[PDB]
Design a protein around this ligand. Structure first.
Ligand SMILES: CC(C)(C)C(=O)N[C@@H](C(=O)NO)c1ccc(-c2ccsc2)cc1
Ligand SMILES: [Mg+2]
Ligand SMILES: [Mg+2]
Ligand SMILES: [Zn+2]
Length: 889
């Protein structure tokens, strides 16, 4: 159980200056020849030369063209190649090797593997060592000269990093291509692609240097028509980095490639970004609406890496959040500017406060810069990425746009072309902080705690207003619960963006203000406040914290209606719902525990329902925002507020609350569903793949949300609407008709209809699978079995497996069936998947992350299945480590 510690970072005693690869792809094997031009570093102390190399079959290895003999000069144990030091030269030397690998049977999808008819690599984090021997860590920077050869018919398109400098024919129907990439890079940014790829291309001319950049987007021939939006998103990303950050692309060409089998969303290999097909390909006929924001985000994300990750790289993997948190932050700025909808920021906050807050209060909780790891694959987390992004975003909130851009430029200018650490970034921001505060005395040392301290801070408020003095006070307290990482938690630097709303006319009472909370508690006083305000707190969600606003529901309602800030409006609504949910939960729980024959439930606040109606009926209000206010908080947001959560009782609670609101507003919902149709479903640009209207998609989101509400409520003759809806050309609509039809005997009719519509597009079929998996059906277990037998079968495609199972695990009532049979089902799938793909097996564990937050019976059921999984003799290191930590062993 090798544990790596952040504090233990030492530079290698070796240097690798040049990599010369020959990758020869054949039918049953791939032969990899490598020459490493190496040197001895100043940190060398005469140690053995130890290479990473996992699953390589050695034909031969050499030093300076002298063959090495196994056992006396080296040992290999399928993980580490150890060359005894006495045979290691003491100046510059060449190490060479020839190994055999087998991408055809590499179902783990790391290293070099076959996806359908495409050969592709994935090297982050430790994948390069599965291709050839290397000192596989990101601070080993080298030059790369790579030749790929293959059957010309099967693999006409050959790609790698850098410039293609030669193309040549080989006897026996083969051809080769040579790529030279002179700039130094870490090995996890190496990539190679071979296949029968088709493309779209365009030319981009950079803003300041006017350099011409060739843009290529690749897929298999069948889906080449789905590439157009991706290419537009790439143009957009380049323009945004130029316009916001002043950063131009530095290379001649950028390639994006879609493959069907991929563990994650995409990978930023230099000049050769490789994508999960579901994050690159779309068409309006064959994609749900969400694909358009997904592709925008992921193309943007990999593009912004070219600076934050690729030109400024990592010293060690413990600095992962320095490239990932920073790049998610850049991606979020981009997406907010491109979509111009408030729901974009709301969707990221919604994600963080559900999924990442759950993680941060689970036994898996870690800071965004961990102190140790066993399996690096288990560190690519919503904490490192999304909390990371919020920590990166707080610098911008604290500094404002001008000084943030000054600080960012300092970072890029002072670290371009080298490795860096989180401290480097904090340093650069600190220089900006000094400039903005106008005294060299100011510092951001406390800010570093955001990197080292795990857990979600709680922030609470108390208010005071003196009418005679016109004086207003906001007393603020912060607190982080102790956990297994820090016994004592320290106060953080918390930026609190605030406004003060005049409750009589809804107007702003003060200018934009960011309170800097740096103590455990503070009191912020405001003079010349004419009337008692309602505070608008953490505008834009200005810190990743639990907000306890201590406002009445009347005050929250007033903010919901009249505040300027989308997040505070959305949060005030969230807070009203949570108070209701907690109250009704406890009433239902008490009734169940005491086996009461009768009892009372607290009704939903009637003025709250009135406010929802007011917003819904306002034509000038935003459709996406409206869809949020008629939806209760995510189950995974709710569970952070309830101990021993009885999922049945929560399901009853949600049902009561939805019914209460629907009993008042269903006629309003129906009226809107009908009136939104013309604009929401407008077909004017349906055959234009570059025309994307995020407002219109939001209108469809609202219609489909309303349709779902009206369907669960069995609104009179709604089935008619559902049937018409299924005839819509937009897959968001006709797939919605499938899931809302669950409450009617027409379900399997629509099941068959929508299957036939989906079956001939790989990605659409996967969306169909998700829709079925998530269907609110009493026979969902039987339905899942049908999917397994008829559609999924023994597919090793991670998109297929995730589609069939993950959405189901969000079925509150059915997945958490008290028998434990849902838990048993997913555990079987995890154990089955772990035999060929440990990464995806660990992803499939996600339902278990909340295990110690449930009622005691369900806790026990989940724990049993995890221990059962842990006892599998063949369990992967990845899965074992994850479950060991999750079950607090
Ligand atoms: C978060 C998302 C969807 C943008 C994504 O695909 N992330 C990538 C990434 O950062 N691309 O630039 C990602 C996620 C996980 C890994 C990973 C590697 C070893 S285990 C998980 C690598 C890349
Ligand atoms: Mg092997
Ligand atoms: Mg397939
Ligand atoms: Zn990334």
């Amino acid at each position: 159980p090798k544990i790596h510690y952040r504090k233990d970072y030492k530079p290698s005693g070796f240097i690798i200056n040049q990599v010369t690869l020959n990758i020869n792809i054949h039918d049953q094997e791939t032969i990899v020849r490598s020459v490493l031009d190496m040197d001895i570093s100043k940190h060398n102390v005469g140690e053995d030369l130890v290479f990473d190399g996992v699953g390589l079959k050695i034909n031969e290895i050499s030093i300076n063209n002298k063959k090495l003999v196994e056992g006396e000069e080296y040992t290999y144990d399928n993980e580490f190649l150890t060359i005894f030091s006495k045979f290691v030269p003491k100046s510059k030397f060449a190490f060479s090797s020839e190994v055999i690998i087998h991408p055809e049977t590499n179902y783990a999808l790391t290293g070099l593997y076959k996806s359908k008819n495409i050969i592709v690599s994935q090297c982050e984090a430790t994948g390069f060592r599965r291709i050839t021997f290397f000192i596989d860590r990101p601070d080993m920077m080298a030059k790369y000269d790579v030749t790929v050869t293959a059957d010309k018919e099967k693999y006409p398109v050959l790609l790698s990093n850098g410039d293609k400098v030669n193309e040549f024919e080989i006897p026996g129907g083969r051809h080769g291509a040579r790529f030279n990439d002179p700039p130094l890079k870490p090995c996890y940014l190496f990539a190679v692609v071979a296949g029968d790829l088709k493309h779209l291309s365009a030319t981009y001319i950079t803003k300041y240097t006017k350099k011409k950049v060739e843009l290529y987007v690749f897929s298999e021939e069948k889906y080449v028509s789905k590439l157009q939006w991706a290419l537009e998103c790439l143009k957009k990303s380049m323009a945004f980095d130029e316009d916001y950050f002043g950063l131009e692309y530095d290379l001649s060409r950028l390639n994006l490639v879609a493959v069907s089998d991929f563990n994650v969303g995409a990978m930023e290999n230099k000049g050769l970004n490789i994508f999960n097909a579901n994050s690159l390909l779309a068409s309006k006929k064959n994609s749900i609406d969400f694909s358009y924001a997904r592709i925008l985000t992921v193309v943007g994300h990999e593009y912004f890496h070219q600076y934050t990750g690729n030109r400024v790289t990592l010293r060690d993997w413990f600095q992962l959040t320095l490239k990932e948190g920073l790049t998610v932050h850049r991606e979020n700025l981009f997406s907010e500017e491109m979509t111009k909808t408030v729901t974009t920021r709301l969707s990221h906050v919604d994600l963080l406060r559900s999924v990442q807050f759950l993680e941060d209060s689970s036994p898996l909780s870690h800071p965004i810069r961990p102190e140790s790891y066993v399996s690096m694959e288990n560190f690519y987390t919503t904490t490192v990425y999304d909390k990371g992004s919020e920590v990166m975003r707080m610098y911008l909130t604290i500094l404002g746009e001008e000084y943030y851009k000054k600080g960012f430029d300092i970072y890029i200018k002072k670290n371009d072309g080298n490795t860096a650490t989180c401290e480097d970034f904090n340093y650069a921001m600190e220089q900006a902080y000094k400039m903005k505060k106008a005294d060299n005395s100011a510092n951001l040392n406390q800010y570093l705690l955001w990197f080292s301290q795990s857990g979600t801070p709680h922030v609470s408020f108390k208010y005071n207003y003196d009418a005679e003095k016109k004086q207003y006070s906001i007393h603020v307290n912060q607190y982080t619960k102790p956990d297994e990482n820090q016994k004592e938690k320290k106060p953080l630097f918390i930026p609190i963006s605030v406004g003060l709303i005049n409750p009589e006319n809804g107007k702003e009472m003060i200018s934009q203000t960011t309170l800097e909370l740096t103590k455990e508690s503070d009191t912020f006083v405001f003079n010349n406040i004419a009337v008692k305000p309602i505070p608008s707190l953490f505008r834009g969600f200005s810190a990743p914290v639990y907000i306890e606003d201590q406002l009445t529901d009347e005050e929250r309602i007033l903010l919901l209606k009249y505040d300027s800030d989308a997040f505070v409006r959305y949060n005030s609504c969230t807070n009203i719902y949570m108070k209701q949910i907690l109250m009704n939960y406890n009433e239902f729980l008490k009734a169940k525990n005491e086996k009461l024959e009768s009892f009372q439930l607290t009704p939903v606040n009637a003025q709250f329902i009135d406010a929802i109606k007011y917003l819904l009926e306002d034509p000038h209000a935003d459709a996406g925002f409206k869809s949020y206010i008629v939806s209760l908080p995510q189950d995974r947001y709710i569970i952070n507020f309830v101990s021993n959560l009885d999922t049945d009782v929560l399901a009853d609670t949600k049902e009561y609350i939805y019914k209460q609101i629907g009993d008042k507003l269903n006629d309003v919902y129906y009226k809107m569903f009908k009136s939104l149709e013309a604009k929401a479903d407008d077909l004017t640009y349906f055959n234009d793949e570059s025309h994307v209207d995020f407002d219109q998609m939001n209108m469809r989101t609202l219609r489909n949300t309303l349709l779902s509400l009206l369907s669960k409520a069995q609104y009179p003759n709604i089935l008619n609407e559902i049937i018409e809806h299924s005839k819509s050309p937009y897959p968001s609509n006709w797939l919605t008709s499938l899931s809302v039809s669950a409450y009617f005997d027409k379900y399997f009719e629509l099941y068959d209809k929508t299957y036939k519509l989906s079956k001939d597009d790989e990605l659409l079929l996967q969306e169909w699978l998700k829709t079925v998996s998530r269907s609110d059906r009493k026979d969902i277990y039987e339905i899942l079995k049908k999917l397994e037998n008829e559609v999924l079968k023994d597919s090793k495609n991670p998109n297929d497996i995730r589609a069939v199972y993950l959405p189901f695990t969000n079925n509150l009532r059915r997945f958490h069936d008290i028998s434990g049979k849902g838990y048993k089902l997913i555990a079987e799938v995890i154990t089955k998947t772990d035999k060929f793909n440990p990464m995806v097996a660990t992803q499939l564990c996600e339902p278990f992350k909340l295990w110690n937050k449930l009622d005691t019976k369900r806790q026990e059921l989940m724990l049993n299945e995890m221990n059962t999984m842990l006892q599998e003799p063949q369990i992967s290191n990845n899965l074992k480590e994850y479950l060991l930590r999750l079950t607090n062993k």
